[PDB]
Design a binder for this molecule. Structure first.
Ligand SMILES: *[C@@H]1O[C@H](CO)[C@@H](O[C@@H]2O[C@H](CO)[C@@H](O)[C@H](O)[C@H]2NC(C)=O)[C@H](O)[C@H]1NC(C)=O
Ligand SMILES: *[C@@H]1O[C@H](CO)[C@@H](O[C@@H]2O[C@H](CO)[C@@H](O)[C@H](O)[C@H]2NC(C)=O)[C@H](O)[C@H]1NC(C)=O
Ligand SMILES: *[C@@H]1O[C@H](CO)[C@@H](O[C@@H]2O[C@H](CO)[C@@H](O)[C@H](O)[C@H]2NC(C)=O)[C@H](O)[C@H]1NC(C)=O
Ligand SMILES: *[C@@H]1O[C@H](CO)[C@@H](O[C@@H]2O[C@H](CO)[C@@H](O)[C@H](O)[C@H]2NC(C)=O)[C@H](O)[C@H]1NC(C)=O
Ligand SMILES: *[C@@H]1O[C@H](CO)[C@@H](O[C@@H]2O[C@H](CO)[C@@H](O)[C@H](O)[C@H]2NC(C)=O)[C@H](O)[C@H]1NC(C)=O
Ligand SMILES: *[C@@H]1O[C@H](CO)[C@@H](O[C@@H]2O[C@H](CO)[C@@H](O)[C@H](O)[C@H]2NC(C)=O)[C@H](O)[C@H]1NC(C)=O
Ligand SMILES: *[C@@H]1O[C@H](CO)[C@@H](O[C@@H]2O[C@H](CO)[C@@H](O)[C@H](O)[C@H]2NC(C)=O)[C@H](O)[C@H]1NC(C)=O
Ligand SMILES: *[C@@H]1O[C@H](CO)[C@@H](O[C@@H]2O[C@H](CO)[C@@H](O)[C@H](O)[C@H]2NC(C)=O)[C@H](O)[C@H]1NC(C)=O
Ligand SMILES: *[C@@H]1O[C@H](CO)[C@@H](O)[C@H](O)[C@H]1NC(C)=O
Ligand SMILES: *[C@@H]1O[C@H](CO)[C@@H](O)[C@H](O)[C@H]1NC(C)=O
Ligand SMILES: *[C@@H]1O[C@H](CO)[C@@H](O)[C@H](O)[C@H]1NC(C)=O
Ligand SMILES: *[C@@H]1O[C@H](CO)[C@@H](O)[C@H](O)[C@H]1NC(C)=O
Ligand SMILES: *[C@@H]1O[C@H](CO)[C@@H](O)[C@H](O)[C@H]1NC(C)=O
Lengths: 121, 431, 187
């Protein structure tokens, strides 16, 4: 919530993003894949002397299709590819002894807790 | 009953994909700027850490949802300069290269129908000092530790992703979803898709102008119905806003204490007697934060199911042609186009609808010479006096020949067989 | 482990240890402190159980998805796009993992593409010929019909196309000959 001062220290490398004022990072004109998300399209990384750099994330490579009204492209060879997919199916089963947790081995606490048995059930 | 004409229909489907990301400063909400309350609250630090862990899980999940729906392909295709698509006009859904935001006309219309609670994420301290505070609801939220975090992808990046998806589908059909995009003329792709609902290619090639005109008119109807709808996307905004404002309002509860104001208690009472009242207030305000976080978790689970559905629709309706009924609109699915909406996605489903039906008498088989003839891929019909074979979804009568049927058995077993002649188109040539 | 750590909270009592309270205080004065501790620890257990319920719902959705994948990718061949990997799905093999499953999806990927000129139909004798299940392509000088996903050129014959109408309506029709593989045999 600062437009670059309500900051702890000014230092240098003060850079303004729509996510806020960023202090302590050098801004570069490249566009890499996102390492650490900052927000509003801005990402950060630790690069090469080593320093924190802040950039605008790239979405991917740009290639234009050669479209015409009488032109087709047919594959001539194929590839057989094997890929993996991971899925969770189950989690740990747990049980709680309510009196053991709340009172330990205190008899008086158990006599007091007898008023809340419905909640443990 | 066989249809004789068709209809090309475009319908819309709206899906929520993400919700607002929020963070809480626990001490700011519970104690304000009271040092004594903070020293008392140091006994409950684990609960504030636990609440923030749950909220950060929700916040990263929102970006994962948006990535899974919109960022499937990593090639940013560009639409060709020459717009020769056989008479189909996609200008209304392709990006306008003159507006600041490179958004299509329909996306611009959609974005003006959902009103966000706050535009922008930089509200400075000097901007609301004095009167403006406690009147404006956002500043009232921010003076009590309740902040809204911005999403990772901007609107412009999502518009870029949708334009890449559109260019891929209209220049390469469905090939770009399985590997490299292979270009093909748009009418030949349309003929392929007609093959996929059981209609021969010649129907498309003969009726191409009518089909293109029907598509263009339907797109115009979509446009004219939007400039006149998005309740599923407005209620998400409303729910988040209402929850944050309810948290701000719950700060006036006593919870069984003398007052709900800490400064009033701290004057007029000494520490040993002020501690019990402060303790009541602390317990109440921790309970309020806990309730907020629980309901945020349940809502995030619902949004996550919706975003999984949106990703499945993007894969199966936009990157291919789906044969499962009613998944991609009403009618036989032809193709779909995505458009980005604030916190969501809109799908334009183009489907095929059978239009004008006529009545015919029909028969399972034909008995020619003690043989039973069955259609290869059609149905036997009669106009009253004569017998033809046609295709099920469009009426195109033809003469029954041997290159048109197949024989199996005699005529003594099939229940409703009829007597007719089969041409056999070789006898004239042999003579 | 968070449940174990939350046992050191006072919840507004003199101490978080029951034995410390029970010595130094008589039952009527120890009861109010014990009551504070009891309320706090019941709240902790309640929070744990609620978050366990929400997590179990998410795992249940994941397991339903895994069962659907097992049915449609391993016990059959799926035609829905991207459900069983990237590419045209051929088959899948399951492997068990601790608390989960791993799927090995074998798919088919088109590899090396070549450019051709194409046409919707062929005009032979005032008739329009369309491919039965292929596409018409040209290497530049000659015209063949092939299949869409693999390049295997063939001569256009009548047992290979089908006729519909004349040549006056189709937008991009071209002129070529259709073999008709019966005339040589009749002669
Ligand atoms: C930070 O403040 C600067 C200075 O006021 C803002 O820059 C202005 O933004 C408005 C918004 O459209 C423009 O009309 C002005 O021309 C800009 N002026 C200058 C000198 O740049 C800026 O918008 C603020 N930062 C953020 C992220 O909102
Ligand atoms: C089709 O692709 C395969 C590989 O995917 C080609 O086989 C390779 O051919 C090169 C030389 O041509 C060899 O050095 C490799 O060892 C071969 N690989 C394998 C796995 O055998 C094949 O030649 C291609 N066919 C055509 C017609 O292009
Ligand atoms: C099939 O349906 C289309 C409309 O869905 C018909 O085209 C219309 O024909 C009427 C007169 O016959 C014209 O007034 C309309 O302007 C036409 N609409 C369009 C979009 O061109 C077509 O005639 C029908 N064909 C048959 C054989 O019934
Ligand atoms: C495709 O559709 C667009 C929009 O429907 C057409 O552009 C309009 O054309 C009319 C004239 O018929 C003009 O009065 C409008 O102002 C145009 N609108 C825009 C936004 O340009 C366009 O002519 C259609 N055909 C082609 C080939 O683009
Ligand atoms: C059913 O279809 C038959 C075959 O097309 C129709 O007979 C044709 O009628 C037209 C119009 O009189 C003639 O020009 C053709 O020569 C006829 N063909 C034959 C083979 O006779 C017949 O009219 C139709 N019957 C009904 C009741 O509509
Ligand atoms: C279809 O044709 C067959 C024979 O071509 C007919 O079967 C004969 O019908 C006559 C008179 O109905 C009987 O006397 C014969 O005994 C039948 N069986 C033979 C000749 O094997 C059959 O009835 C015809 N179906 C009709 C007219 O609906
Ligand atoms: C297109 O294909 C035709 C038909 O295969 C090619 O013509 C053949 O060329 C080979 C090599 O010279 C000859 O052995 C055949 O006898 C030719 N067949 C005919 C029917 O002429 C032609 O070379 C190809 N054109 C291009 C530009 O690649
Ligand atoms: C395909 O063949 C048809 C006839 O076989 C051509 O149509 C004739 O073309 C000539 C010269 O272009 C005209 O003078 C005739 O009037 C056309 N119509 C007839 C004879 O009915 C057609 O042009 C050919 N297509 C080509 C060469 O691309
Ligand atoms: C980045 O680009 C801007 C404008 O294009 C330029 O003024 C600036 O110097 C560039 N920075 C670097 C490090 O090249
Ligand atoms: C088909 O015949 C039935 C029988 O009366 C009639 O009710 C129906 O309207 C007919 N359908 C058409 C399209 O003529
Ligand atoms: C249809 O019903 C009629 C009686 O209404 C009967 O004579 C005829 O055999 C039936 N046809 C079939 C195929 O069952
Ligand atoms: C097909 O032709 C276009 C037109 O220039 C070209 O850019 C593209 O590389 C060609 N594809 C192949 C596989 O040669
Ligand atoms: C393809 O475009 C050319 C002009 O570039 C045009 O002459 C030709 O008729 C078009 N073909 C079809 C099938 O529309």
């Amino acid at each position: 919530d600062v437009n670059c001062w309500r900051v702890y220290s000014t230092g240098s490398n003060v850079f303004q993003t729509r996510a806020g004022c960023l202090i302590g990072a050098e801004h570069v004109n490249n566009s890499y894949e996102c390492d650490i998300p900052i927000g509003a399209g801005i990402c950060a990384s630790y690069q090469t002397s080593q320093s924190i750099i802040a950039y605008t994330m790239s979405l991917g490579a740009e290639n234009s299709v050669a479209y015409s009204n009488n032109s087709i492209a047919i594959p001539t060879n194929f590839t057989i590819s094997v890929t993996t997919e991971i899925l969770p199916v189950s989690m740990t089963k747990t049980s709680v002894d309510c009196t053991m947790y709340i009172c330990g081995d205190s008899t008086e606490c158990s006599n007091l807790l007898l008023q809340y048995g419905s909640f443990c059930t | 009953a066989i249809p004789t004409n068709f209809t090309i229909s475009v319908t819309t489907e709206i899906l929520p994909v993400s919700m607002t990301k929020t963070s809480v400063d626990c001490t700011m909400y519970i104690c304000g700027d009271s040092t004594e309350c903070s020293n008392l609250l140091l006994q409950y630090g684990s609960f504030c850490t636990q609440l923030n862990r749950a909220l950060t899980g929700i916040a990263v999940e929102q970006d994962k949802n948006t990535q899974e729906v919109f960022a499937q392909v990593k090639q940013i295709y560009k639409t060709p300069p020459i717009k020769d698509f056989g008479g189909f006009n996609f200008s209304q859904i392709l990006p306008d290269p003159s507006k600041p935001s490179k958004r299509s006309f329909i996306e611009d219309l959609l974005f003006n129908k959902v009103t966000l609670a706050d535009a922008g994420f930089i509200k400075q301290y000097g901007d609301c000092l004095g009167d403006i505070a406690a009147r404006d609801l956002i500043c009232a939220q921010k003076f009590n530790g309740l902040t809204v975090l911005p999403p990772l992808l901007t609107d412009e990046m999502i518009a870029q992703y949708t334009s890449a998806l559109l260019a891929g589908t209209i220049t390469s059909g469905w090939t770009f979803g399985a590997g490299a995009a292979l270009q093909i003329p748009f009418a030949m792709q349309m003929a392929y898709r007609f093959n996929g609902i059981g209609v021969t290619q010649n129907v498309l090639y003969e009726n191409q102008k009518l089909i293109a005109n029907q598509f263009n008119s339907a797109i115009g109807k979509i446009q004219d119905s939007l400039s006149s709808a998005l309740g599923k996307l407005q209620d998400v905004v409303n729910q988040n806003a209402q929850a944050l404002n309810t948290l701000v309002k719950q700060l006036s509860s006593n919870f069984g204490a003398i007052s709900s104001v800490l400064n009033d208690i701290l004057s007029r009472l000494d520490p040993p007697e002020a501690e019990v009242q402060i303790d009541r207030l602390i317990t109440g305000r921790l309970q309020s934060l806990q309730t907020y976080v629980t309901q945020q978790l349940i809502r995030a689970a619902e949004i996550r199911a919706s975003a999984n559905l949106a990703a499945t629709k993007m894969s199966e309706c936009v990157l291919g042609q789906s044969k499962r009924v009613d998944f991609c609109g009403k009618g036989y699915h032809l193709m779909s186009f995505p458009q980005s909406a604030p916190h969501g996605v809109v799908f334009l489903h183009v489907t095929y609808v059978p239009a004008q039906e006529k009545n015919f008498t029909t028969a399972p088989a034909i008995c020619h010479d003690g043989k039973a003839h069955f259609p290869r891929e059609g149905v036997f019909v009669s106009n009253g006096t004569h017998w033809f074979v046609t295709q099920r979804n469009f009426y195109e009568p033809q003469i029954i020949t041997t290159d048109n049927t197949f024989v199996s058995g005699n005529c003594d077993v099939v229940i409703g067989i009829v007597n007719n002649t089969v041409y056999d188109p070789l006898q004239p040539e042999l003579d």
